[PDB]
Amino acid sequence: MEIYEGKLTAEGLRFGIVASRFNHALVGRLVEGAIDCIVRHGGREEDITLVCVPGSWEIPVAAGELARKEDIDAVIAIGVLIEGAEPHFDYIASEVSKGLANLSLELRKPISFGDITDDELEEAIECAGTEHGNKGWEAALSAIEMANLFKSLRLEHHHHH
Amino acid sequence: MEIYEGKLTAEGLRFGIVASRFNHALVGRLVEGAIDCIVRHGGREEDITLVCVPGSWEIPVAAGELARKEDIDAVIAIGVLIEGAEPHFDYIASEVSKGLANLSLELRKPISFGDITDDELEEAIECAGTEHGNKGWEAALSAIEMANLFKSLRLEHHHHH
C-alpha cells in the first residue's frame, strides 16, 4: 500500500509566518514558539519569513502574499483574538478561519491555524505557558509535518519521473 | 531572518476612501478623522480618492472599482451601521465583512474597515474626540501601514530585481 506521512525534520524547508500585533502580550510568546520548534527541529531560520500586521483582520491578505512566493513551502497563521467586541470576534474569527482555508485549497500550500481564540484573558494565560502547549510550538510542528508531507507528495511525483 | 513591516509615512501614497451617507451626522466626523491622520503623517491630500454612496449596501461595489485603479495603493472602508433594520444589519454588515474581505484577497490590495458598529448614537459621538478612537483615524492608520507593507513586500521584490 502506498502511504505518505511526514517525519518532523525541518531540514531543507523555508517557512512563512504572519503575526498580528494586537494583544502582543501573547503574540511574542507564540511567535518565538514557532521559531523554536522550527530551528530546534533542524530548520534554519534565514529561510523563515516573518510579516507583521495591525490586527487579526489582515492576516488573510498577507498569507496570500506569502504563499504565492515560490520559495515558501508552508505558512503559519498567528494571532490572538480576545472577545473584544462580538461583531469583531465572531465575524473576524470565522472570516479568517474560512479565508485561510480557501487560500490553501487555492494556492495548494499548507496553512496551519495558529490562532488562540480565548473567550477570556485567563485562557490566554493558560496556553502561552510552560506545559509545552504553546500554540505556536504546535501549529509550527503541524506545518513541518505538512511541509515534509507535500514534499513527500510532490517528491514522490517529481522524482519518480 | 527576513522581516517586513511598514512605517506610517503617508508620503508618495494615493489612497481610497469609500463613504456611506446613511447616518451622515457622524460619518462626516469619521472622514475628517481619516483624512486628518493621512495628511498629518505627511501625505498630501490631493491623492485622496473619496467616493460617496447612499446606504451601507453599495460599500463593496464602489471599492471594487477603486482598487482596480493602478494608482490607488489602498482603500479605506468607511460607513456606519446602526441597528436600523436588523435583517439589514446581520446580512448587510456581514456581507460587508466578507465582500470587502474577498475583494482584498482577490485583488491582492488591502482594504481597511472603517466601520463603526454602534447600537446607540452616543457611543459614536463619545469616541471621535481627543483619544482618537475616531475609528477612521485608526482604519486610516492601518491602511497606511498595510500600504507601506505591500509597497514593502512587492518593492523588496521589484527593486532586488
Next chain:
Amino acid sequence: MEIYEGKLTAEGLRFGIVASRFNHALVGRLVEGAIDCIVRHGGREEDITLVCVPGSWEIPVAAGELARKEDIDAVIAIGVLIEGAEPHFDYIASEVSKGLANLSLELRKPISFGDITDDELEEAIECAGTEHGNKGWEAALSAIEMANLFKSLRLEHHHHH
C-alpha cells in the same frame, strides 16, 4: 480633492428589472413604483428591460444574464419574500442577498436590492397607495445613483484618456 457621486437623472441610461411572480399581488405594485422613478427621473422607458420568472429562487440566474449584456447599466432586483416555509425564507433569502452580491462584485455592475420582506398583505397595501414608501421606488433610486455614479467613475476614466 476629487469626489465622485451620482445625480438622480435617468438620462442616457439602460436599466435591468428582474421580477418574481410569487405573491404577484404586491409585485404589480412595486414594479409600478420602480418604473415610476426611472421614467419620471429623466429616463425613457424604451430601454427598461423587464425579465420575469417564477419564484424568488430564480432571481439571481436572471440578473447575471442582464448584467452580461453590454447595454444594461444597472439591474433592479425585485421580488417579495414572505415568511412562508422557514426553510425557504432563511436559506433562499440569504442566497439572494449573497447571490446578487457576488454577481455585482464579479461583473463590476451595480445591482440593487428591491426585496420587500413583509409578514402580511396589509403591510404591502400600506406601501402601495401613496405613503411614498414603495421599496422598489427606492431600489430604483439607489440604482440610478449607482448607474450615474459608475458612469461617473468609468466616464471620468475614459474621458481623461
Next chain:
Amino acid sequence: MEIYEGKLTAEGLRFGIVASRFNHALVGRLVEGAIDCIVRHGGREEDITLVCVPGSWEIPVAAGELARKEDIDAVIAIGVLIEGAEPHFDYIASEVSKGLANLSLELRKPISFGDITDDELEEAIECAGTEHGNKGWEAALSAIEMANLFKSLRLEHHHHH
C-alpha cells in the same frame, strides 16, 4: 496667519533616550514603546541614543548631557516611580519634573516627560498594556511632533535667510 505645527514623520531626526533601570519590570516595555513609535513613524534607529542609569534620581544629569550634543534633536524622559518611600517619590518626582523642565528652557531642546507615576502596582499594570496607551509610545510621539516643530520653527528661520 503664520502657523507652525508638526507632522509626525520621524524622517531625518536623531533622538535622545534616558532610562531608569529601577523597576525594569515596566521600563523595558516603555523603552521598546518609544523605539517602536520612532521607527514605525519612519525614523531610523542608528540615530537614536539610549543611556541607562540606576534610578529616577539620575535622569536629570543624563538628559543634560544628551541635549548638549549637537546631533540630538529631542530627548525622551523614561522612568517609573512606585510610591516606594514618600521622601523619594514626592521629592525625586517633583525634582526631576522641574529639573527636566529647566533643562529644556535652558538648552532650547524639547523634553518629553516619559514617566509613569503610579501610586500602586496595579496602575503600573494598566499603562504598559495592550490598549496602545504605552506611555513610551505616547511621549515618543510628543517628541517627534515637537522635533518636527522646532525643526519647523528653526527651519522657517534658517532657510528664509
Next chain:
Amino acid sequence: MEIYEGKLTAEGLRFGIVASRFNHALVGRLVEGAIDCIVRHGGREEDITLVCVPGSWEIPVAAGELARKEDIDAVIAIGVLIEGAEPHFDYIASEVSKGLANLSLELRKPISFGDITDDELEEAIECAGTEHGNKGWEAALSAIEMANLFKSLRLEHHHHH
C-alpha cells in the same frame, strides 16, 4: 543603536565623600560600607577624598568645592537626617535634595545621595548588616556606575576625537 552604560570597576577613579557628623553613631557605619564597596570593586582607597562637617546643612557647600576639583570624578553624598527638628527636616532635607541636584546638573558631574532618612534609629542599625541596604554601599555603587558612565560618555567623545 548607540547605548551607554557603566560597569562597576573602581579602577582608575578618584571619588568624593562628604559626611555630616550629626548622628555619628550610624554615620561611621555608612562611610565604612561606602569605602568598602569602593575598594572591593577594585579601586584604591588613597584617591578617596573624605570631608567632615557638622550637621546636614553644610552638605551642599562642601561638595560644591569637591566637584570643582578637576581630579574628583564623582562625589558621594553622605549624611543622616533623623526627624530631630521638623522645620530642619523639611527645609534642610529638601534643600539638600535640590541643592545637590542643581550642583550636579550645573557642573555636569554626578553626585550620589547617600542619605538615610530614618524616623527611628533601629531601622538604621537593621539595614547596615549583610543584606547591604547599607545605603552608603549603594550610593557608592551608583556613583561608580555614573562615574564610569560619564567617563563612558565624554571619553567616547574625546578618544573618537
Next chain:
Amino acid sequence: MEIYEGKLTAEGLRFGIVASRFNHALVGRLVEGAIDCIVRHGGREEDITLVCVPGSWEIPVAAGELARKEDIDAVIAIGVLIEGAEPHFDYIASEVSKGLANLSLELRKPISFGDITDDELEEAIECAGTEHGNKGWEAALSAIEMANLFKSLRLEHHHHH
C-alpha cells in the same frame, strides 16, 4: 556569546534503550512511544540497541555496558516502578536515580530517565495516548537533544581542530 543547544534530528545517531520487564503491560507501551519518536524525527531504527532485563534493579548495570560502546551516543532509561514493595521503591528507585546519574557523569555520556513512577496503573494507561506524556516519547526526545548537544559540544571541539 558562544551558545550550544541541540536540534532533534535523529539522523546519524545510534541510541541505547534499556528495559525492565517488571510490569510489562505498560512497558511495551513505552518503548513503542520511544522508538516512535526516534524514528519519526528521521533516525533509522536499526541503530537502536534494545536490552531486556527482569526487574528495575539491573537497569543500571545494563546501561553501564551500553555506554562503554564507542558507537552508542546516548542511552534511554526505561522501566516502571509501581509501589510493589516499598523498601524496593525507596532504595531501588533512588539507587536508579543516583546510579544512572553517576554513570552519565562518569562516562561523560548522557542517559535519559524514561521512568514512569505510577502509584496506580490507570494513571499510566491514561498518559500514553495522543497528548504524548508517553514518558518514553519524552525521555527519547531529551536523549536526542542531549545526543546532538554532546555531538554539538565535542564536535565544535574536534572539527574546529
